[PDB]
């Protein structure tokens, strides 16, 4: 399914409000393919380059699925660097600005979303500063870069701390062997968008 406009995606009013306020008009090719299966809760592998359109894809998907009145961390995003983590927080907070979504960057009240590098997130879990109990969505951004930087084993230990029932969304410009190994381990009949 390709849905070529945001109004036909069954998104919440308050979320669409953030989308139009940000300045988006028409969904990009990745947004037209990926938003729907992400919001339906499927595991998703998306081959996508760095960019706002990519970030807004998983931001929208997370935001649509949040229970805003439940003040617990419901989604966890891993990125290769503190700078990328901060960009993601910035995009998420702009898009969620009309729905009361909270988002903290873990880069060295519980927020709805935490985004950070694998090392910092792993530490936060070990120190009980982040509870895995209510995390329903686990997003791995630029997975190729995280794995090339040597984060595989810390990513695996994080995944081990999360509930069995999570949705996993993995985004990567390239799909090397190591990336494909993670999708096979972490995902169940994933949607593939390559």
Residue numbers in the entry: 30 to 137, 151 to 236
From the paper:
DExD/H-box RNA helicases, from virus and bacteria to eukaryotes, play important roles in processes including ribosome biogenesis, RNA processing and folding, ribonucleoprotein (RNP) remodeling, RNA nuclear export, the regulation of RNA translation and transcription, and nonsense-mediated RNA decay. DExD/H-box proteins often contain accessory regulatory domains and localization modules, but their cores consist of two RecA-like domains joined by a short flexible linker. The N-terminal domain is commonly referred to as conserved domain-1, or DEAD-domain, and the C-terminal domain as conserved domain-2, or helicase domain. Both domains contribute to the binding site for RNA substrates and both contribute to ATP hydrolysis. We used X-ray crystallography to determine the structures of the DEAD-domains of DDX2A, DDX2B, DDX5, DDX10, DDX18, DDX20, DDX47, DDX52, and DDX53, as well as the helicase domains of DDX25 and DDX41.
Also known as eIF4A2, an isoform of DDX2A. The DDX2B structure features an α-helix 4 that is longer than in other helicases, and leads into an unusually closed P-loop conformation. As a consequence, the ATP binding site is not visible on the surface of the DDX2B structure. This conformation is most likely induced by a crystal contact in this region.
